[PDB]
Amino acid sequence: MKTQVAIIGAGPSGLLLGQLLHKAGIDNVILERQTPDYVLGRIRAGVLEQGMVDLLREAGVDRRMARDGLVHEGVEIAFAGQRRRIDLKRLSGGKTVTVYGQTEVTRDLMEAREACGATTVYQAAEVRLHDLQGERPYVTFERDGERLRLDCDYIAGCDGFHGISRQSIPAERLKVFERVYPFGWLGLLADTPPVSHELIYANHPRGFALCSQRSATRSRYYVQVPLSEKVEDWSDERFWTELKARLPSEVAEKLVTGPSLEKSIAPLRSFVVEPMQHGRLFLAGDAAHIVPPTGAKGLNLAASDVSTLYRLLLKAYREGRGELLERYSAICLRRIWKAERFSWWMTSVLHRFPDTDAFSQRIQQTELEYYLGSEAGLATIAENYVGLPYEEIE
Amino acid sequence: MKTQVAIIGAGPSGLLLGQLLHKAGIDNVILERQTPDYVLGRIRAGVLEQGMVDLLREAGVDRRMARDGLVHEGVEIAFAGQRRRIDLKRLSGGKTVTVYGQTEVTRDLMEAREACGATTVYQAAEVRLHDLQGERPYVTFERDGERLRLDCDYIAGCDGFHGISRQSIPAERLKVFERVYPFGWLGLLADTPPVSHELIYANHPRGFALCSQRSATRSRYYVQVPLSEKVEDWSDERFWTELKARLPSEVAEKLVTGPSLEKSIAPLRSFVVEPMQHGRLFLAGDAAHIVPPTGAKGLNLAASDVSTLYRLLLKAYREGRGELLERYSAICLRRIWKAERFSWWMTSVLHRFPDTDAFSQRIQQTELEYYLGSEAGLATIAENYVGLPYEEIE
Ligand SMILES: Cc1cc2nc3c(=O)[nH]c(=O)nc-3n(C[C@H](O)[C@H](O)[C@H](O)COP(=O)(O)OP(=O)(O)OC[C@H]3O[C@@H](n4cnc5c(N)ncnc54)[C@H](O)[C@@H]3O)c2cc1C
Ligand SMILES: Cc1cc2nc3c(=O)[nH]c(=O)nc-3n(C[C@H](O)[C@H](O)[C@H](O)COP(=O)(O)OP(=O)(O)OC[C@H]3O[C@@H](n4cnc5c(N)ncnc54)[C@H](O)[C@@H]3O)c2cc1C
């Protein structure tokens, strides 16, 4: 087989890139290790930045989102028995965020891809990348036992943190920056109405808690738990009891509980690689960087990498300006580092760290008191939360 | 002897409090361990907040300052070979800071006190505090061998970090928060013209550097040095060479060097005690808290403690409202913690820490890039730098 752009991975990144590309007349093939069902089983993200919402519209896949997505103009932060609302819309100069689950976005993209008839090979086993610096790179994979070869001009690694693409770049050409946090997030999805019309991030002495949502009748809650925890040790009831213990009394009082549709523990980590490309290979999304969940930046940074890669590829194909692709990493990294700083900051002010001295606890509290009580402080959170602007290019 | 308010310490705090008090008709006696000459030999502070400038005017000791003080509308931060100016005046809504040395302020207050004829006992040896919870506390000291007793209604501990007042409060009644930094500031005072009309804080790979001033012909420079350093190991020439290596080329190029008038190493530390009072004893200034030099908050927080203590004492004496004094600590601590957070933040983004991993260095750089490039970010620095408002009281 032959194509123009080979895409490794059919998660949000790969699908969004493939859709934008297909629409502009640039053929592309997506190779995915798993089955459609497996991919669709991942809950993950719930909050989308306006930039992501616009990219979905550009890809022509925004019908269901415009109908079912919930637009939020603010978020709350609870600490020391007090709730403080950050008016995102007012403080950011009018931007908002949209709550629409990653499962839904992924479903929307998959349906859109099927209808247009673009190529997607699921269960593509043992993908290998070859001749990354040649003028003609290629991908080999196994489909039901037979090893097939796919020739292409460029390869976009949209295979997530454990993908093959980042591993295919000579380790010496890469610089890695990583921080592992001593805790994880225990999440629970339930078919119960959310306790509030807006999200509530809570810093409590017992640990972090977050009240989120997926729709008017589906909620997503999270509690900070140490890394030693096994999800089998958390019955639905133990979780609700713990959640309630971490929320302000008036919030825990009106919480509608129910059986879990899904429960899982996500460990927190920060990770960035520089550069994000090697030869004809370009990394995007979780393949190039991981941000802790706090602040909802992961899927949102993937979207900007994608927006940037798509536009550079368009220039290369439509305008014969292939030299612009050398700028990919420089452009992406500027936004990646600022979002990493934001997620890192949010995580550090909202969670309870293990070996914390009295001075640090007081500074943590004061950070909250300052940023939440100052108009300039509220504005730094707000502009960061809605998402910093995308870089123009050229 | 008998007085109304006994003040331990004749540094800025004690003198300013005594002056405000004397002027309002509240007798007070100041006891100081050292000689006037010794106190006057301490260089220290150079930057004053507007609140401090106003307090000096209220105390009627602002003639020389209004004449010789330099008003600054901005400060610069240099990092990664780029200088960025923070327009304090524009970004804070019109406030500025005033550069007038602590030595001068102290000299102005001492002269003002002498002229009014208020009591000041220098070389008051081995001061001890007694009956702090009684209705009649007293202070004993030694003057040329004889142990004398001073009776008073209240005692204000303005004796700095190593003073006797904080040590006189039963250790169990106090909560201490402290952070010691793994570096100090090597400062050099010279009769040379400053390299710039505004201060320049510089983050450089070799360590922190700061270009300050005292007048049109007197400069004050600082460089970060490890705690193992002895000032005798730093010749004037070694210092200038090191300073120049840390500044942007265009700044080091026009630097006028010269012999040191004073050289010394100040170790960095954060320290706060809660509460700041015990019975008839009230702590103010360095006796109650220490902030690292970064941000110029030390002498400025002492001024607000003083402003607060003076006004509460006025209420107690003039209005017979002695119960209001129980609010001293609560009022002071609100401002102290926010200033501590600011000094801590400045210190952490401008200095080079010893065991720093790649992720942290990049976050440090990104913190600078974000706050210095965002209007909301610049505003958080600016409003903090000029000094947060004083709490009203009652
Ligand atoms: C608890 C949680 C909450 C989050 N909340 C938010 C939020 O609200 N907002 C937000 O912005 N972000 C959030 N994120 C982050 C977001 O979910 C991720 O950044 C997003 O999944 C990245 O998409 P991706 O396509 O880059 O990678 P992935 O979603 O991981 O998909 C990569 C795909 O590549 C496939 N693949 C892997 N290896 C191979 C291979 N060898 N060959 C072929 N295919 C392969 C995988 O099977 C997978 O389907 C959250 C994440 C978590 C865990
Ligand atoms: C390098 C440096 C730079 C700084 N830069 C700035 C700046 O630009 N702006 C700013 O806001 N702050 C700055 N500070 C902080 C500022 O100098 C201090 O906060 C200030 O000195 C506090 O004054 P004070 O009167 O509370 O205490 P001190 O100045 O320490 O005076 C306390 C007095 O009490 C006396 N005393 C001590 N023990 C006894 C006793 N047992 N009996 C009687 N008397 C006693 C002492 O001799 C001393 O005279 C800086 C400090 C340093 C070290």
Give the whole-angstrom CA distance, residue A103 versus residue A220. 13
- Bond preceding residue A275 cis, omega within 30 of 0: yes
- Residue A376, phi then psi, degrees to nearest 5: -75, -35
Q: Is A325 exposed, middle or buried (0-12, 13-18, 19+ CB in 10 A)?
A: middle
Inter-residue contact B127 to B156 (CB < 8 Å): no
Q: Which residues line ligand 2 (CB under 6 A)?
A: B 8-14, 31-34, 39, 44-47, 102, 124, 127, 158-160, 162-164, 185, 187, 266, 285-286, 293, 296-300, 302
Alpha-carbon B356 to chain mean position: 29
Strand B200-203 relative to strand B74-79, pairing: parallel
Please tell me if the CB atom of residue A46 comes closer than 6 angstroms to any atom of ligand 1.
yes
Q: Which ligand is nearest to the CA of B142?
A: 2
Count other C-beta atoms under 10 Å from residue B60's C-beta.
Answer: 12
A interface test, pick of B273, B359, B361, B365 with most A CB neighbours within 10 Å: B359
Peptide bond before B275: cis, by omega within 30 degrees of 0? Answer: yes
Give the C-alpha separation, B370 to A251, whole Å: 35
Give CA A261 to chain center in angstroms.
21
Burial class (CB in 10 A: 0-12, 13-18, 19+), A382: buried
Asked whether the beta carbons of residue B366 and residue A179 sit closer than 8 angstroms, the reply is: no
| Residue entry with tokens 């303005």 | B158
Burial class (CB in 10 A: 0-12, 13-18, 19+), A196: middle
Residue B377 and residue A380: Cβ atoms within 8 Å?
yes
Which of chain A's residues have a Cβ under 8 Å away from the Cβ of B337?
362, 366, 369
**Cα(A183)–Cα(A207) distance, rounded to whole angstroms?**
10
Mutation target to probe the B interface, by most B beta carbons within 10 A, among A370, A375, A378, A386 is A370
Spatial separation of the C-alpha atoms in residues A55 and A45, rounded to whole Å? 16
Q: Resolution, in Å, please? A: 2.0
**Cβ distance A282 to A156 under 8 Å?**
yes
Full 3-state SS string of B233-269: HCCHHHHHHHHHHHCCHHHHCCCCCCCEEEEEEEEEE
How far apart (Å, rounded) are the C-alpha atoms in residues B10 and B86?
35
Phi, psi for A93 (deg, rounded to 5) = 85, 35
Planar angle of CA B268, B273, B276, nearest 5 degrees: 130
Q: Which positions ≥6 away from A253 have C-beta within 8 Å?
A: none
Contact indicator for B379, B91 with CB cutoff of 8 Å = yes
The answer to whether the beta carbons of residues B245 and B237 sit under 8 Å apart is no
Q: Which residues of A touch B341 (CB under 8 A)?
A: 363, 366-367, 370
Q: Inter-chain contact B341–A363, Cβ cutoff 8 Å? A: yes
Triad B381, B386, B389: Cα angle to 5° = 105
Q: Evaluate whether A30 touches A10 at the Cβ level (below 8 Å).
A: yes
The pair of three-digit structure tokens given for residue A9, joined into one six-digit string: 């991975």
Q: Which helix (H) or strand (E) holds B63?
A: helix B63-68
User: Which chain A residues are within 8 Å of B367, Cβ to Cβ?
Assistant: 341
In terms of Cα–Cα distance, which of B363, B324, B80 is closest to A336? B363
Q: Which two tokens stand for residue A370?
A: 């300052």
Q: For an interface test with B, which of A178, A274, A366 has the most B Cβ atoms less than 10 Å from its Cβ?
A: A366
**Half-sphere exposure in the Cβ direction for B313 (13 Å, CA):** 28
Helix (H) and strand (E) counts in chain B: 13, 20
Q: Please check whether residue B218 is in contact with residue B191, taking contact to mean a CB–CB distance below 8 angstroms.
A: yes
A72 as an active site residue: the answer is: yes
Closest CA in chain A for residue B334: A366
The preferred substitution site among B44, B165, B214 for testing ligand 2, maximizing ligand atoms within 8 Å of CB, is B44
CB atoms within 10 A of CB A127: 24
* Residue B328: DSSP 8-state: H
From the CA of B253, how many Å to the nearest CA of chain A? 31
What is the number of residues in chain B? Answer: 394
Residues A188 and A110: their CA atoms lie apart, in Å, by 25
Q: To which residue do tokens 């930094």 refer?
A: B181
The amino acid occupying position B204 is H
| CA-closest candidate to residue B361, choices B373, B371, B374, B348 | B348
Contacts of A295 in chain B (CB under 8 A): none
Q: What is the CA radius of gyration of chain B?
A: 21
Tell me if A282 sits within 8 A of A276, measured CB to CB. yes
Summarize chain B as % helix, strand, coil (round to 5): 40, 30, 30
Domain regions of chain B by residue span: 1-72+96-180+269-351, 73-95+181-268+352-388
Task: Give the angle B112-B117-B119 at the CA atoms, nearest 5°.
Answer: 105
CA pair distance A338, A345, nearest whole angstrom:
11
Question: In terms of C-beta density within 10 A (0-12 exposed, 13-18 middle, 19 or more buried), how is residue B67 classed?
Answer: exposed
In total, chain A counts a number of residues equal to 394
Q: What is the 3-state secondary structure (H, E, C) of chain A?
A: CECCEEEECCCHHHHHHHHHHHHCCCCEEEEECCCHHHHHCCCCCCEECHHHHHHHHHCCCCHHHHHHCEEECEEEEEECCEEEEEEHHHHCCCCCEEECCHHHHHHHHHHHHHHHCCEEEECCEEEEEECCCCCCCEEEEEECCEEEEEECCEEEECCCCCCHHHHCCCHHHCEEEEEEEEEEEEEEEECCCCCCCCCEEEECCCCCEEEEEEECCEEEEEEEEECCCCHHHCCHHHHHHHHHHHCCHHHHCCCCCCCEEEEEEEEEEEEEEECCEECCEEECHHHCEECCCCCCCHHHHHHHHHHHHHHHHHHHHHHCCHHHHHHHHHHHHHHHHHHHHHHHHHHHHHCCCCCCCHHHHHHHHHHHHHHCCCHHHHHHHHHHHHCCCCCCCC
Measured CA to CA, the distance from residue A25 to residue A317 in angstroms comes to 9
Q: Do A376 and B376 touch (CB under 8 A)?
A: yes
Contact A358 B179 (CB under 8 A): no
Q: Tell me how crowded residue A47 is: count the other CB atoms within 10 A of its CB.
A: 24
Asked if B64 contacts B355 with a C-beta cutoff of 8 angstroms, the reply is: no
Q: Ligand 1 center to residue A199 CA distance, Å?
A: 22
Distances (CA, A) of B285 to B13, B37, B296, B302: 6, 21, 13, 4
Among candidates B26, B27, B32, B34, which has minimal Cα distance to B13? B32
How far, in Å, is the centroid of ligand 2 from the Cα of B178? 18
Q: Is the dihedral of CA B308, B313, B315, B320 positive or negative?
A: positive
Number of cross-chain residue pairs from A and B with Cβ atoms under 8 Å apart: 69
Closest C-alpha among A225, A227, A338 to residue A289: A338
Which of the following CATH numbers is that of domain B1-72+96-180+269-351: 3.40.1280.10, 3.40.50.300, 3.40.50.720, 3.50.50.60?
3.50.50.60
Neighbours of B254 (CB within 10 A): 9
The fold of A73-95+181-268+352-388 is D-Amino Acid Oxidase; Chain A, domain 2 (3.30.9)
Query: Quick one: which of B166, B114, B120 has its CA closest to B143?
Result: B120
Cα distance between residue B157 and residue B276, in whole Å: 10
Angle subtended by helix axes B358-371 and A328-350, to nearest 10: 90
Strands, sheet with A70-72, edge to edge from the N-terminal-most edge strand = A47-48, A97-99, A70-72
Question: Do A19 and A113 contact (CB within 8 A), yes or no?
Answer: yes
Q: How far from B39 is each of A56, A157, B106, B138, B142, CA to CA, in Å? A: 68, 67, 8, 25, 19
Ligand 1 atom closest to Cα of residue A302: 26
Do residues A391 and A307 lie in contact, with contact meaning Cβ atoms separated by under 8 Å? no
Contact between residue A243 and residue A237 where contact means Cβ atoms under 8 Å apart: no
DSSP string, B32-56: ESS-HHHHHT-----EE-HHHHHHH
Q: Are strands A119-122 and A28-32 parallel, antiparallel or unpaired?
A: parallel
Is residue B159 part of an annotated ligand binding site?
no
- With beta carbons less than 8 A apart as the criterion, state whether A108 and A100 touch: no
CA distances in angstroms from B238 to A46, B151, B194, B233, B259, listed in the order given? 57, 53, 19, 9, 12
**Spatial distance between the Cα atoms of A105 and A71, rounded to a whole number of angstroms:** 15
Among the listed residues A22, A204, A297, A351, the single catalytic one is: A297
C-alpha B137/C-alpha B152 separation (Å) is 6
Residue of A nearest to B180 (CA): A359
Nearest CA to ligand 2 atom 9: B296
Give the ligand whose atoms come closest to the C-alpha of residue B15.
2
Q: What are B's interface residues with A at a Cβ cutoff of 8 A?
A: 175-179, 270, 272, 337-338, 340-341, 344, 357-360, 362-363, 366-367, 369-371, 374, 376-377, 379-380, 382-383
Q: Residue B149, Cβ neighbours under 10 Å: how many?
A: 12
